[PDB]
Design an enzyme around this catalytic site. Structure first.
Site, PDB file in Angstrom:
ATOM      1  N   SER A 164     -22.370  32.075  41.867  1.00 16.76           N
ATOM      2  CA  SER A 164     -21.099  32.242  42.557  1.00 16.76           C
ATOM      3  C   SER A 164     -19.874  32.355  41.645  1.00 16.76           C
ATOM      4  CB  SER A 164     -20.955  31.089  43.540  1.00 16.76           C
ATOM      5  OG  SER A 164     -21.516  31.369  44.816  1.00 16.76           O
ATOM      6  N   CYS A 180     -19.479  32.336  46.921  1.00 13.75           N
ATOM      7  CA  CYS A 180     -18.400  31.421  47.194  1.00 13.75           C
ATOM      8  C   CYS A 180     -18.102  30.748  45.881  1.00 13.75           C
ATOM      9  CB  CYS A 180     -18.867  30.470  48.264  1.00 13.75           C
ATOM     10  SG  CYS A 180     -20.281  29.425  47.811  1.00 13.75           S
ATOM     11  N   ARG A 181     -17.865  29.429  45.840  1.00 11.58           N
ATOM     12  CA  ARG A 181     -17.619  28.722  44.595  1.00 11.58           C
ATOM     13  C   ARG A 181     -18.896  28.442  43.805  1.00 11.58           C
ATOM     14  NH1 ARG A 181     -14.122  25.003  42.023  1.00 11.58           N
ATOM     15  NH2 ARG A 181     -15.439  23.741  40.636  1.00 11.58           N
ATOM     16  N   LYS A 182     -19.886  27.814  44.445  1.00 10.86           N
ATOM     17  CA  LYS A 182     -21.089  27.358  43.762  1.00 10.86           C
ATOM     18  C   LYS A 182     -22.399  27.577  44.516  1.00 10.86           C
ATOM     19  CE  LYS A 182     -19.523  22.684  44.876  1.00 10.86           C
ATOM     20  NZ  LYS A 182     -18.881  21.642  44.095  1.00 10.86           N
ATOM     21  N   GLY A 183     -22.459  28.576  45.408  1.00 10.88           N
ATOM     22  CA  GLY A 183     -23.682  28.867  46.119  1.00 10.88           C
ATOM     23  C   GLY A 183     -23.886  27.964  47.318  1.00 10.88           C
ATOM     24  N   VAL A 184     -22.922  27.123  47.703  1.00  7.63           N
ATOM     25  CA  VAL A 184     -23.171  26.265  48.850  1.00  7.63           C
ATOM     26  C   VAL A 184     -22.614  26.752  50.180  1.00  7.63           C
ATOM     27  CG1 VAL A 184     -22.684  23.934  49.728  1.00  7.63           C
ATOM     28  CG2 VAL A 184     -23.572  24.264  47.465  1.00  7.63           C
ATOM     29  N   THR A 185     -21.298  26.969  50.376  1.00 13.79           N
ATOM     30  CA  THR A 185     -20.801  27.423  51.676  1.00 13.79           C
ATOM     31  C   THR A 185     -21.183  28.863  51.976  1.00 13.79           C
ATOM     32  OG1 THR A 185     -18.598  28.172  50.881  1.00 13.79           O
ATOM     33  CG2 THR A 185     -18.865  25.861  51.558  1.00 13.79           C
ATOM     34  N   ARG A 199      -8.075  30.527  48.157  1.00 18.36           N
ATOM     35  CA  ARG A 199      -8.871  30.521  46.938  1.00 18.36           C
ATOM     36  C   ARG A 199      -9.409  31.919  46.662  1.00 18.36           C
ATOM     37  NH1 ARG A 199     -12.512  25.187  47.531  1.00 18.36           N
ATOM     38  NH2 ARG A 199     -13.740  26.208  45.901  1.00 18.36           N
TER      39      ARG A 199
HETATM   40  O1  LIG Z   1     -11.786  24.248  50.239  1.00 18.43           O
HETATM   41  C1  LIG Z   1     -10.687  23.903  49.817  1.00 18.43           C
HETATM   42  O2  LIG Z   1      -9.750  24.684  49.777  1.00 18.43           O
HETATM   43  C2  LIG Z   1     -10.435  22.482  49.335  1.00 18.43           C
HETATM   44  C3  LIG Z   1     -11.369  21.894  48.301  1.00 18.43           C
HETATM   45  C4  LIG Z   1     -12.613  21.384  48.987  1.00 18.43           C
HETATM   46  C5  LIG Z   1     -13.712  21.459  47.963  1.00 18.43           C
HETATM   47  C6  LIG Z   1     -15.035  21.974  48.499  1.00 18.43           C
HETATM   48  C7  LIG Z   1     -14.859  23.160  49.461  1.00 18.43           C
HETATM   49  C8  LIG Z   1     -15.400  24.505  48.990  1.00 18.43           C
HETATM   50  S1  LIG Z   1     -15.865  24.460  47.241  1.00 18.43           S
HETATM   51  S2  LIG Z   1     -16.003  22.464  47.055  1.00 18.43           S
END
Ligand SMILES: O=C(O)CCCC[C@H]1CCSS1
EC number: 2.8.1.1
Length: 293
Positions: A274, A247-252, A186
């Site tokens: 993010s 990251c995507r939305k501030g969570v991981t 990603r």
């Molecule tokens: O992380 C991946 O590649 C699969 C989708 C899993 C969705 C969540 C993980 C990080 S953003 S929401």
């Protein structure tokens, strides 16, 4: 956050003993912060079925700025305060947060950081998550937890948070290392971004990639500080320099903050908008995708 750092990680053994000692109450509140993509697992139903005795469900869907276009954005101070106060958490409560993710930890670091960005330092993550609570046959119940409401005062700690405008300035100033916790595909732009319409993958120009899952052992436990330190080093991320996790939305991204915190760095700021907000607001020239754009 502070100079002497609070124990960011609590073991299952510790929590089990505290629960048998009857310690959860106004001084120790436990939260299940589980959230999973729509259609995979059902966080609230799982909670209702099995939770550590006395734990409440922290709903990240509720506790957010519902008016924002972007994903899981912080609530206001008042919003956080009222929500957390109805869960029986006061400014004196040691809050222990876990989630039931298969990896051992996913949303629990986000709620850890939320308490910290609203000024509450006595918050820990259950190391190993509900996964290892369960694996070790510790007590679970479906009994309803109905805490007395408490009053909580929330004060936003702005240095633990970064906005769009600040990450945009950083493209030019380069004063912060930007570390992206998304999985490598990603980040590189070879794997698509899930659950969104017309969102490309790729990364903000100048990001380093440190996939959050690499911070956990196969068993779901946090890697030791030594291993963490070595990972930051191998990725050229200097822990003495400013760092913004995205990251995507501030969570991981909060996993980068937790790991850095366990290495003695308490001040990783989270770009809460993010990639989801960045893609939507930034000029295309500010990011790169190996699948071009
Ligand atoms: O992380 C991946 O590649 C699969 C989708 C899993 C969705 C969540 C993980 C990080 S953003 S929401």
């Amino acid at each position: 956050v502070h100079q002497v750092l609070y124990r960011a990680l609590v073991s299952t053994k510790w929590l089990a003993e505290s629960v048998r000692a009857g310690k959860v109450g106004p001084g120790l509140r436990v939260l299940d912060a589980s959230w999973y993509s729509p259609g995979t697992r059902e966080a609230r139903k799982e909670y209702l079925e099995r939770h550590v005795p006395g734990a409440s469900f922290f709903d990240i869907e509720e506790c957010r700025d519902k008016a924002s276009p972007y994903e899981v954005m912080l609530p206001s101070e008042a919003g956080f305060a009222d929500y957390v106060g109805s869960l029986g958490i006061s400014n004196d409560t040691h809050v222990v947060v876990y989630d039931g993710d298969d990896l051992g930890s996913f949303y629990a670091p986000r709620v850890w950081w939320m308490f910290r960005v609203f000024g509450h330092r006595t918050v820990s993550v259950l190391n190993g998550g509900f996964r290892n609570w369960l694996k070790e046959g510790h007590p679970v119940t479906s009994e309803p937890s109905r805490p007395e409401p408490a009053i909580f005062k929330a004060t936003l700690n702005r240095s633990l948070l970064k906005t769009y405008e600040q990450v945009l300035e950083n493209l030019e100033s380069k004063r912060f290392q930007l570390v992206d916790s998304r999985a490598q595909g990603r980040y590189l732009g070879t794997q698509p971004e899930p659950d969104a319409v017309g969102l490309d993958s790729g990364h903000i120009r100048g990001s380093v990639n440190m996939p959050f899952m690499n911070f956990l052992t196969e068993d779901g436990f946090e890697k030791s500080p030594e291993e963490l330190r070595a990972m930051f080093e191998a990725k050229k991320v200097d822990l003495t320099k400013p760092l913004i996790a995205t990251c995507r939305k501030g969570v991981t991204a909060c996993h980068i903050a937790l790991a850095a915190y366990l290495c003695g760095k308490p001040d990783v700021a989270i770009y809460d908008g993010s990639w989801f907000e960045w893609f939507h607001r930034a000029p295309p020239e500010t990011w790169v995708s190996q699948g071009k754009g």
